Nucleic acid binder design. Structure first.
Lengths: 144, 164, 163, 146, 105
RNA sequence: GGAUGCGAUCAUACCAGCACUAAGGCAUCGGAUCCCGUCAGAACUCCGAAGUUAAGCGUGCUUGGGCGAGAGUAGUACAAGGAUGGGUGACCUCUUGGGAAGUCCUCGUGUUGCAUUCCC
RNA sequence: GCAGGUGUCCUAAGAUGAGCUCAACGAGAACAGAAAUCUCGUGUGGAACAAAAGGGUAAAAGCUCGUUUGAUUCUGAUUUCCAGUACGAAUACGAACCGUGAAAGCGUGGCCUAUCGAUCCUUUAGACUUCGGAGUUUGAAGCUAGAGGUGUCAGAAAAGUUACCACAGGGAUUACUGGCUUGUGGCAGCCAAGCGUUCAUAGCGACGUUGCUUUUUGAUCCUUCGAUGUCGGCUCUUCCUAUCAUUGCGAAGCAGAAUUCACCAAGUGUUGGAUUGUUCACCCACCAAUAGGGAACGUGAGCUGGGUUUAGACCGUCGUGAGACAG
RNA sequence: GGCGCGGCUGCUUCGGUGAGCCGUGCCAUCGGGUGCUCCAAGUGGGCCAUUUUUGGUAAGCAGAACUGGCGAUGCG
RNA sequence: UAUAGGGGCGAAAGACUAAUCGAACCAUCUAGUAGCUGGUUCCCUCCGAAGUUUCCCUCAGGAUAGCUGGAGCCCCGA
RNA sequence: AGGAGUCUGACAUGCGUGCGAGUCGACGGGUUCUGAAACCUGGGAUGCGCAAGGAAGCUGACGAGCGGGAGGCCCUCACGGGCCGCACCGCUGGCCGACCCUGAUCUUCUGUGAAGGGUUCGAGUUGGAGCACGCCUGUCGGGACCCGAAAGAUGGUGAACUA
């Protein structure tokens, strides 16, 4: 059988949720909210990839710790940081380095696995209760 | 009318007892407690009204898998139709009978191995049976449990019974 | 005749040279194994052959990590047989040595293994200098791993219960 | 289909297939869900020679190449005893050490249709038919099925 | 129909006691109103005077048959619970009293 | 050889009938102020020995009707597999593997596990 | 398909523990028959358990008595639901929390075998979350859980006519011819109670019983719905036999004689009219007698066109009405 | 599968026990009829015979069960 | 020479409005939409059906298993 | 003679190939042939990934084997066992958010946060991935293999027929 509307099956993806069954994710409300306005984005990278690219990250200066072991501001290591509201460091998988990471947010089990002598650094915007008191100073970076 | 499985429907052995089994059952059955890997029948006493499975299960032999308080979980496999899975049944010991066949067997195994030890220190029969056993690596079991519960979802009886 | 024997015609037929290997250099490699296999001791090369015919559901990425814990000096730095390819994903200061043999590696993996020790070997140089294919570890898959068995379709797919 | 499954268990996958079976009531309870569909019985030592000679075929590790001259003296496996023709025919019908598993033939006799026919197929031994158990007449029937 | 006491003892659900105390039974309806809901979707979506899917108010309807229909309100803490399904109708209450036993009269 | 406690096998453990736990290894029995209780110690129950073996508990026997179990006696019904086997037909039938049943005889008016452990 | 139940009713018709054990029959009690009540004896599941059926159970699961609240909250392995599919339901836990109870324990709703409702919204519960410079009130939005409609019960908001019709299809399904069946119908055999003054069988013949036909009716749904022209009639050919007459027969309650029943037998005959569309049938005179039954109810590329059976219309009946009727 | 050694645990008297777990050693008539994954098909309307049926006088009836065939299978 | 499409005109039948009327004709939307009927064009090979079950405004369909088949991967089973 | 799986999107796949914890290139310019197009390059675009939960705050570890069973070695070699060892599947249990409970050190605005457990849900290891195009196959879509009805709607053209 065919007319491809008698064996086909059917026309548009319905009889499928209501009364026949399988498939979509189906039957909805449910949360909805926030709008298209006050919305995303928070950029997030786990500290094991900065540890990939410590040795090859030779645009980030080494300093008080040995030459492998670098201060690096993570805001200027995260692709698509500039259209994001803040850059956060996530805590998965090891760090075997003596780094100094600068972030706009850090996890609590994000400092803790690279406790292994570190200085974990808030940027001014991490607070974010820090004084843009008309004044002058600090800023967010911009690039494509 | 659609078919079902009226869980209570057709029940005469499954709830009636012979003349010789009527009246209250002695509490020793109610008291009996089993160990894991015991083989036990499921077959209701009809004169106990609670802790029963759903009646279709009766006359199947199961393995005691684990226990929850008062009633026990016994593992069984359903039968006939298509692709059928192992299922676990919650039953109190009032409907669950120890297998005498399995005790007899356990005994017949020991008898066999008393002889195996005797006949391998001064005796001869077989030879070939001595060559397998001695090699083996063992043991227990749940790989081969999944092996069991995949062909008993049976093949050719399923297609044979799938049209008529 | 029987019905049994008809079912006997219905076994497999697994058999395949894959539809294309567009790479000529793979295409010659996949034949070589049926001449060499029945002509040496090498069961391993005979296994690699099936797995470099048939499928993409079969062709392996192996990470330097997935070599690295798994080779760990207690089969003492043998020759590691990776049917498909190595991938570059680890930093430890990686492998304890190593002779790794594969169809393909990435350039970063090629660079990092040879500056740890041994050689990143190609499978043909392996067939020349290890024709017996013994003291060798077949390491490994995957497509059999976490993502994706039957976990397809949209939003999936699940332990199961239902899907 | 239950009996057809039993014809396979004895291996018997076509008409005029044959397989040798052993000594029991238990085997003949098994056989007597198959009785109307088979004929059976003891063929003598010579009639097993002049059937092993006629209709024997080769083993696995190759195909079949057969139980012809060369290839039973020198070929055929055997780990139990000497595999060779004359020797095997005595060992199988003398029924001793590992000779219920020397049968384990290679694997069905492919019999010729009988010479001059049956007396009719739909009938048992009692009524002058072919089906069922009969020592005498099996050795007649296999020497027709050449 | 049912004797149900208006005054009963029960367990609390609520996390300030999380133990047993005196509770008061009452049958409940209000409705809303101040309009943010379905009521708005209708006000707007009239749209040629069409009430439309504001009616499933009918079928002409009638089968009769409930569940218990309660909220039991603590007289010693204000934390208090509704109850789970089993089958009633209709329901009597008043301040109870009682289906009193026993009678000689 | 065994009465007294707690139980297993739960129609071989009954209905009925005839001897026996017993001069210091029981129940009937007596006091009921009493705990306890009832309407009322009758039951219930604190207390307890004068009687009793007469019982109940239970011990030797009685098969009588009951029945488990079995022995002969009814291979009869019934049914699985297979038949160019018969019959107008409902039906029968051979073969292959199986086979209750009533009567009579019989065994049986317990058996078993833990206790307190006793007269000889 | 048979048989019959549930869409309720219950804070005690639940829980537990101590304590008791029947229904019922005999015997006894002035009056009381319905007579309870009170007593004794016998009394094993026949009683009792709200409610179908069924099955279960005797210091109970049944009875009696007191107390009690667990018909508490939250969670669920798993069975049923369904072999993997939801709500429901069960069968248990653990966590929290109580009871009774000597306590061990029992208690996760109703002897058991298990006794119902998603989805938006609304309702409330508890705590917490949230609504775009800060700051502060108001509501909103929301998580988790329970109750309010869906008995078209795995969830629509919901009456008819068409004979003015139309369309896509179906012989998947009717009327209808055919085919199967043959209860119904027609006819027969057997048996022979019985009646015929007496006499079963001149004749008549019940009950019961076995058949044959396929020509009434019923049943079925195999055949056709890209089409099988309807009933009745007419004319025209042919046939069957269960024979109405005629030929030849047998019996008689065959004296003649009209006859009565039956045998063989299909060659030839079997009509003309009055009413009705009628088939059928009623009637009239006829006649030797005016037989029945098939051939696609023989017969519309023959006829006819009265009925049936379109579109118009009336009456009666029904319907608020359109409109409907085996009128 | 069975045993021993050693640790740890449980439920249920400051009480008795096994079972579970981990670790370590020891000792033991058939014959590919076959597992798992992805993606797709007509369906998602049958028939008959045999056996066992239930309704129906019955039916080339209706409606099940158990099976073999037709459908989709020639040839005699 | 008026009156034009649920409008006209009708001594009203659903009559009549250019051979078309229980809603004219034309062109367009438009390649409507059809759980329905029909048809859908080269060779061969390996295996080879289902006409069943739950749900479903469901029974001339969907849906989901059941019945199949390919393609890969591995080395028990009566 | 004409006459029916078309077109490409999405979502899911099969088969293949390049790089592989990112890959991925428009638009401009630069430049030949060519209306084409190509090549370099900034690299738009910021997917799917790279890790997750959920209303919302805001938080966020990767160690283990056990069994079967690939294979090497030791040996000792007719046999043969012992060890590791990882594929892969089955089986075990801890973790990371969410919920619920106990929370030290203590900070002492305020609350963060070691230890530990229950519970389901999703996540992480021995269950570590992709992207890209091509070629496939499906689904849904747009007329959606092709034909096939009566229709309903808009705007015009008809009273030379007929009322």
């Amino acid at each position: 059988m065919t007319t491809r509307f008698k064996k086909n099956r059917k026309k548009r993806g319905h009889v499928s949720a209501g009364h026949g069954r399988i498939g979509k994710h189906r039957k909805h409300p449910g949360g909805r909210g926030n709008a298209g306005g006050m919305h995303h984005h928070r950029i997030l990278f786990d500290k094991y990839h900065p540890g990939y690219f410590g040795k090859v990250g030779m645009r980030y200066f080494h300093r008080l710790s040995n030459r492998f072991h670098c201060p690096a501001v993570n805001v200027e290591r995260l692709w698509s940081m500039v259209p994001a509201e803040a850059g956060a460091g996530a805590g998965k998988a090891p760090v075997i380095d003596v780094t100094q990471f600068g972030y706009t947010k850090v996890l609590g089990k994000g400092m803790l696995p690279p406790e292994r002598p570190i200085v974990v650094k808030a940027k001014l915007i991490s607070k974010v209760a820090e004084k843009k008191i008309k004044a002058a100073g600090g800023a967010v970076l911009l690039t494509a | 009318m659609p078919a079902g499985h009226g869980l209570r429907s057709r029940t005469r052995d499954l709830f009636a007892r012979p003349f010789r089994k009527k009246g209250y059952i002695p509490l020793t059955t109610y008291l009996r407690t089993y160990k894991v890997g015991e083989h036990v029948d499921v077959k209701v006493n009809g004169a106990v009204h609670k802790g029963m499975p759903h009646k279709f299960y009766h006359g199947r032999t199961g393995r005691v898998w684990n226990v929850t308080k008062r009633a026990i979980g016994v593992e069984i496999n359903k039968q006939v139709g298509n692709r059928i899975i192992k299922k676990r049944i919650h039953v109190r010991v009032e409907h669950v009978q120890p297998s005498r066949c399995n005790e007899e067997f356990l005994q017949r195994k020991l008898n066999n191995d008393k002889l195996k030890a005797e006949a391998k220190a001064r005796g001869e029969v077989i030879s070939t049976k001595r060559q397998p056993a001695g090699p083996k690596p063992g043991f227990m079991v749940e790989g081969t449990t999944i092996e069991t519960v995949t062909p008993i979802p049976y093949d050719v009886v399923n297609d044979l019974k799938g049209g008529y | 005749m029987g019905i049994d024997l008809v079912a006997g015609g219905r076994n497999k037929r697994t058999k395949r040279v894959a539809p294309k290997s567009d790479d000529v250099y793979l295409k010659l490699l996949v034949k070589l194994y049926r001449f060499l296999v029945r002509r040496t001791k090498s069961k391993f090369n005979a296994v690699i052959l099936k797995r470099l015919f048939m499928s993409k559901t079969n062709r392996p990425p192996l990470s330097m990590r997935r070599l690295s814990n798994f080779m760990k000096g207690k089969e003492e730095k043998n020759i590691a047989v990776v049917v498909g390819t190595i991938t570059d994903d680890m930093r430890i200061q990686e492998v304890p040595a190593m002779k790794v043999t594969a169809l393909r590696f990435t350039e970063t993996a090629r660079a990092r293994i040879i500056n740890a020790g041994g050689e990143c070997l190609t499978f043909d140089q392996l067939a020349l200098r290890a024709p017996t294919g013994e003291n060798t570890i077949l390491l490994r898959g995957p497509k059999n791993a976490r993502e994706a068995v039957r976990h397809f379709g949209k939003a999936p797919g699940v332990p199961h219960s239902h899907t | 289909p239950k009996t057809k499954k039993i014809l396979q268990l004895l291996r018997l996958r076509q008409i005029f297939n044959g397989v040798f079976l052993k000594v029991n009531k238990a085997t003949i309870n098994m056989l007597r869900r198959v009785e109307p569909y088979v004929t059976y019985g003891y063929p003598n030592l010579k009639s097993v020679r002049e059937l092993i000679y006629k209709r024997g075929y080769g083993k696995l590790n190759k195909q079949r190449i057969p139980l012809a001259n060369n290839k039973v003296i020198e070929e055929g496996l055997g780990k139990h005893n000497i595999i060779c023709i004359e020797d095997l025919v005595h060992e199988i019908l003398t029924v001793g050490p590992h000779f219920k598993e020397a049968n384990n033939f290679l694997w069905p006799f492919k019999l010729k249709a009988p010479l001059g026919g049956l007396k009719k197929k739909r009938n048992h031994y009692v009524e002058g038919g072919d089906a069922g158990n009969r020592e005498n007449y099996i050795n007649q029937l296999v020497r027709r099925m050449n | 129909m049912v004797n149900v006491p208006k005054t009963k003892k029960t367990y609390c659900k609520n996390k300030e006691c999380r133990k047993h105390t005196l509770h008061k039974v009452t049958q409940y309806k209000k409705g809303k109103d101040s309009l943010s809901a379905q009521g708005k979707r209708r006000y707007d979506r009239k749209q040629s005077g069409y009430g439309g899917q504001t009616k499933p108010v009918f079928h002409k309807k009638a089968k009769t048959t409930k569940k218990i229909v309660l909220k039991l309100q603590c007289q010693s803490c204000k934390h208090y619970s509704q109850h789970p399904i089993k089958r009633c109708k209709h329901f009597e209450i008043g301040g109870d009293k009682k289906g009193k036993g026993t009678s000689l009269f």
